[PDB]
């Protein structure tokens, strides 16, 4: 579909943009080279150094199904080496619960689980196919919790929610299930739920530090990309250092950024403008009282709690004077935007509150996060649009919009999107 000897201009040295390359060239795709605006690579997988050791500032984990993590790995020499996760409930308040023992609300929930499995096997098969390329049902655009509820399947949010808002994802009230059920497809909630999830030592980061280097082009870095624009069949990028000439366009950077600095037609404009994102802000911390595990608070995953502190991460066991993170959202379509310093004096009380109190912040983040739609522009065929631009003025649409805000989700659609248009 499109030939060898193309000069193709990655955008983004994240997974997807990384991913890009590695398929590119197994393909026989030799003249790719990654644009990335910072020092640095591996994007939202962001491994720090602190005290001799990494920890995360943003990608922790995956599952054992994440099989094109599993290539990247196989290419690299990396290995699933990091240490175990293991995690409590607390209440708002900071009481311990155990909500897989609740005699009442526990059946109720494994109940819709089962029921939602059995649907998932039969009236939805197909909903977790990467991308969004293949319409999904329906019902799969609705809200989660609407989808839910339409299906008689409300209690298996408590199940879903805890890898899912809690990871900066947003809350199951608006967010269309086709995502939800995709990255939480039944097998990998499963993983989830029993605890089967990969780690890395050396980060999340270091996988496609390793990656980049077995590029035949690694990634080039700090380049400020000023415009870029397609005429005449071909791609102009102009950049604070150089401007160059391509055949193909790949973005794996956010579409409604590109808007600004882009030659962008009536479509994308259209489209792009209506890309919605989550502000999720992770906070780098030294506690006192040091937790002894990892620790969810369904209670502050409630919209009416936003910018509280829904989980938190326990990477060192060993170690007390680690960095515990910290994890809250910021954004939610029926509230204010939450400032950051108010939700830094949340990180501050909710950690004291649950017998850990901060005595220093050493780095904090937000995240542009989990770009999507709506329900509404879902319907709407947002995805049958943007997917039939595939290729217009030689520029293809990929990242965590056109699939799901995962590694394993974008790197996935990176190699389908080389057998999809380019083999
Ligand atoms: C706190 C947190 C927890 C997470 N947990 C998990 C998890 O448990 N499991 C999981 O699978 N995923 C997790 N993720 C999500 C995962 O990290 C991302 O979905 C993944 O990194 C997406 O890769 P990407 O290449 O599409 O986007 P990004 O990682 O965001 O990378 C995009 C790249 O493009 C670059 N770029 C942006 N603009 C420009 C520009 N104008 N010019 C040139 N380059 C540009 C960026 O600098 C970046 O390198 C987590 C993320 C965070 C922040
Ligand atoms: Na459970």
Redesign the pocket.
């Known amino acids: 579909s499109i030939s060898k000897d193309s000069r193709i201009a990655i ?9 890009a390359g590695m398929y590119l060239e197994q393909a026989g795709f030799h003249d790719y080279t990654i ?4 020092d ?7 491994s720090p150094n602190y005290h001799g050791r990494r920890y ?7 599952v054992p199904s ?1 099989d094109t ?1 599993q290539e990247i790995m196989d290419r690299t020499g990396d290995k699933v080496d990091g240490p175990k996760l293991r995690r409590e409930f607390l209440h708002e308040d900071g009481e311990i619960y155990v909500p897989e023992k609740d005699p009442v609300r526990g059946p109720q929930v494994m109940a819709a689980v089962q029921k939602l499995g059995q649907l998932l096997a039969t009236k939805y098969q197909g909903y977790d196919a990467n991308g969004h390329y293949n319409k999904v049902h329906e019902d799969l655009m609705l809200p989660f919790d609407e989808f839910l509820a339409l299906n008689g399947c409300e209690a298996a949010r408590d199940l879903w929610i805890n ?1 899912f808002t809690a ?2 994802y947003g809350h199951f009230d608006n967010v269309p299930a086709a995502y939800v059920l995709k ?1 939480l497809d039944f097998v990998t909630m499963m993983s989830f739920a029993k605890g089967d999830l990969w780690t890395w030592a050396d980060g ?1 980061q270091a996988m ?1 530090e390793h990656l980049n280097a077995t590029l035949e082009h690694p990634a080039e870095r700090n ?3 000023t415009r870029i624009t397609r005429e005449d069949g071909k791609v102009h990028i102009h950049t604070t250092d150089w401007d160059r000439e391509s055949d193909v366009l790949v973005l ?3 579409l409604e ?2 808007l600004d ?1 882009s030659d962008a037609d009536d479509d994308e404009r259209e489209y792009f403008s209506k890309i919605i994102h989550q502000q ?1 802000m ?1 906070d780098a911390c030294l506690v006192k009282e040091y937790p002894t595990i990892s620790g969810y608070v369904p209670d502050n995953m409630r919209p009416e709690r936003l910018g509280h502190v829904m989980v938190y991460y326990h990477r060192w066991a060993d170690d007390p004077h680690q960095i515990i ?1 910290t ?1 809250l959202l910021r954004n939610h379509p029926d509230y204010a935007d939450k400032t950051q310093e108010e939700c830094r004096q949340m990180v501050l009380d909710d950690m004291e509150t649950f017998g850990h109190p901060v005595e220093k912040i050493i780095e904090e ?1 937000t ?4 770009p999507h739609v709506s329900s509404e522009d879902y319907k709407a065929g947002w995805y049958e649009k943007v997917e039939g631009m595939q290729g217009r003025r030689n520029t293809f649409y ?3 919009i056109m699939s ?8 996935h659609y ?1 190699k389908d999107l080389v057998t999809r248009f380019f083999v």
Not at 35 to 38: G, K, V
């Open positions: 955008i983004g040295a994240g997974p997807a943009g990384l991913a644009l990335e605006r910072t640095h690579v591996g994007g939202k997988c962001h995360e500032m943003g990608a922790i984990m995956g994440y993590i890898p990871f900066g990255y999340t496609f380049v400020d990309i794996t950077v956010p950024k590109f600095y999720y992770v993170t994890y983040q995240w542009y996060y989990f990929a990242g965590e799901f805000g995962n590694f394993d989700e974008v790197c990176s």
